[PDB]
Amino acid sequence: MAEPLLVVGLGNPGPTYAKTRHNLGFMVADVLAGRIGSAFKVHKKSGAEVVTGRLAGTTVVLAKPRISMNESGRQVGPLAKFYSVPPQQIVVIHDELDIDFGRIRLKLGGGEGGHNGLRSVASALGTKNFHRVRIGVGRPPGRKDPAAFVLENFTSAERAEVPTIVEQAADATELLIAQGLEPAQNTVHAW
Known part of the structure; x- marks a missing residue:
């Protein structure tokens, strides 16, 4: 009788990746949590880390794949099935190359x-x-390649603004x- 929103933070496992660019999704997720x-407690029937509760006035299932990027879909798919969450009710947080640092954008599809x-998530959801x-x-x-770039840590010049950026992303998520969508992205976007 409740039919939720699934919020997924993307990142890799492990100390080793805790501070990489590719782990912004996790940071935001930790703040929302x-x-x-x-x-976070492990959702045994999916293997992902799941937190359940109220957020921004609604019912929310917060998750972090405990599996690696390449395979996040194998937990996110089942997790979505577990709660009968439609694609439109799924929100994924991730680092973005095609946009400048500290800029936050909301998109559907x-x-x-x-x-x-x-890539993995979409392939699992269909x-x-x-x-x-x-x-x-x-x-x-x-000349540094994208994939490797996102697997490196933030330069210290970046490191300083990261905590603020994460809070803002968390706020934009609650706003969404x-x-x-439309109201939220009109508040968050400017040339």
Whole structure:
């Protein structure tokens, strides 16, 4: 009788990746978890880390794949099936190359850019029609490849603004859930 929203933060396992650009999705997820007030516990029938509760005035299932990017879909798909969550009710948080650093954009569907985790999720759901909270990390230092770039840590110049950026993404996520796509992206977007 409740029919939720599934919020998924993308990132890789492990100390080793805790501070990479590719782990912004996790950071935002940890903040949302803090706002909900509980810790992540493993959802045994899916293997992902799940937090359940109220967020932005509604019922929310917060998750973090405990599997690696390439395979996030194998837990996110089942997890969505577990709660009968439609694609339109799924929100995925991720780092974005096609947008400058600190810029946050909200989108429904469309290409998944160079993000291998998004690729996985869409391939598991059978559709690209889910909401994305894109957190800008920017384009590459001239010849360094995308994938490797997102697997590196933030430069210290970046490291300082990251905590603020994450809170803002968390706010934009609550804004999306509370008000809806159009209203939220009109508040969050400027040239």
